[PDB]
Amino acid sequence: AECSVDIQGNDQMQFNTNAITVDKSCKQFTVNLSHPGNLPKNVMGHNWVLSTAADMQGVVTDGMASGLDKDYLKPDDSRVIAHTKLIGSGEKDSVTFDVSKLKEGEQYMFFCTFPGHSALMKGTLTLK
Amino acid sequence: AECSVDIQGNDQMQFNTNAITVDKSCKQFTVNLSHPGNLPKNVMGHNWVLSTAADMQGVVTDGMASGLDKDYLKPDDSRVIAHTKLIGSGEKDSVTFDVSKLKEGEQYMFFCTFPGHSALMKGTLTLK
Ligand SMILES: [Cu+2]
Ligand SMILES: [Cu+2]
């Protein structure tokens, strides 16, 4: 809360939120992802990946092609501002990034790169 | 085709049609399901299941619970009029069912029961 958010992705291929606001006073922001459910990583794993809206498509496509072994993310993709690893149910993960890598006036999107998920598992991240 | 239809479930969780009509003159009707794309069955499996519009959500909820190994369908689910196997990309499966199992003036829904897919993969079927 304020400089951290808890987000979850369930077995219904939905995130519990589709809008996160990062207050400009946070020096760093922390996302703690958990996966409520029963389905395993290779069938319904989720991750939380951040990029600009313009880069999202490319991240998702190259991510799909990197496979489960790469957590569906192209290794060292420079378009990815921050990301968790891919988790199956009952697993969790956390990521902290520098808010100074975000600029005011730019549209950012968070999403899951597990194949097909981004159509519903996505939302807005905004500096305010 | 006479007394048959071909439908494809792709890698974007989409069926290539949302309406099927069954000619009342057909004694039996066949659905031929294929899955274009490159994604494997555990990640993007699709089946085609038929029920009344009123039974679809109970079939989907109990199907998810039966899991992977049960092709995400409850064994001997009395509300399922007909269904294929769950198939991966490059696979094919047909189902033939008796048309006398369909009433005139009742609404039917076909859908995929792989978790999360019926939100997008579903359509109506009706006698004519
Ligand atoms: Cu996901
Ligand atoms: Cu499906």
Q: What one-letter code names the amino acid at A115? A: P
Q: How many CB pairs under 8 A join A and B?
A: 31
* Nearest to A49, CA basis, from A8, A15, A80, A6: A80
- Min Cα separation A32/chain B (Å): 23
- Write the DSSP symbol of residue B25: T
Place of tokens 């992705």: A9
Rg (chain A; Cα; Å): 14
Type of residue numbered B74: K
Q: Which is it for the CA torsion A46, A47, A52, A58, positive or negative?
A: negative
What ligand is nearest to the CA atom of residue B116? Answer: 2
Contact B44, B90 (CB under 8 A): no
As a whole number of angstroms, the distance between CA A73 and CA A76 comes to: 8
Residues of B within 8 A of A115 (CB-CB) are 11, 39, 43-44
Q: Alpha carbon of A79 to those of A9, A63, A85, A89, B9: distances in Å?
A: 23, 11, 16, 27, 31
Write out the two tokens for B63: 């199907």
Contact B115/A44, CB-based, under 8 Å?
A: yes
Any idea which residue has 């959500």 for tokens?
B57
A116: nearest CB among B42, B44, B68: B44
Q: Which residue has the tokens 């829904």?
A: B109
Mark out the alpha helices in chain B (DSSP H runs): 41-44, 56-66
Cβ-proximal residues to A118 (8 Å cutoff; 6+ apart), any chain:
A56, A60, A111, A112
Mutate which of A15, A35, A39 to disrupt the B interface (most B C-beta within 10 Å)? A39
Determine which of A10, A11, A13 to mutate to test the interface with B (most B C-beta atoms within 10 Å).
A13
Q: Is A19 exposed, middle or buried (0-12, 13-18, 19+ CB in 10 A)?
A: exposed
Q: Do B64 and A11 touch (CB under 8 A)?
A: yes
Whole-angstrom distance, CA of residue A60 vs CA of residue B1 = 38
Identify the CATH number of the domain in which residue A89 sits. Answer: 2.60.40.420
- Alpha-carbon distance B117 to B111, whole Å? 8
Task: Please report residues of A whose CB lies closer than 8 A to that of B11.
Answer: 115-116
Of A12, A115, A120, the CB nearest to B44: A115
> What single letter denotes the amino acid at residue A13?
M
Q: Are B73 and B65 in contact (CB under 8 A)?
A: no
Reported in sequence order, the residue ranges of chain B that DSSP labels E, i.e. its strands, are 4-8, 19-22, 28-34, 49-52, 82-83, 92-98, 108-111, 122-127
Strands A122-127 and A19-22: parallel
Write out chain A in H/E/C secondary structure.
Answer: CCCEEEEEECCCCCECCCEEEECCCCCEEEEEEECCCCCCHHHHCECCEEEEHHHHHHHHHHHHHHCHHHCCCCCCCCCCCEECCCECCCCEEEEEEEHHHCCCCCCEEEECCCCCHHHCCEEEEEEC
Beta carbons of B43 and A43 less than 8 Å apart: yes
Residue B60 belongs to what domain range? 1-128
For residue B42, the one-letter residue type is: N
Which pair of tokens denotes residue B113? 């029961």
State how far the Cα of A92 lies from the Cα of A79, in Å rounded to an integer. 24
Question: How many other CB atoms are found less than 10 A from the CB of residue B115?
Answer: 23
Q: Most B CBs within 10 Å: which of A14, A44, A60, A121, as the mutation test of the B interface?
A: A44
Total tally of structural domains belonging to chain A: 1
- Are B31 and B84 contacting, i.e. CB atoms less than 8 angstroms apart? yes
**The pairing of beta strand B19-22 with beta strand B82-83:** unpaired
Q: Which two tokens stand for residue B128?
A: 């004519």
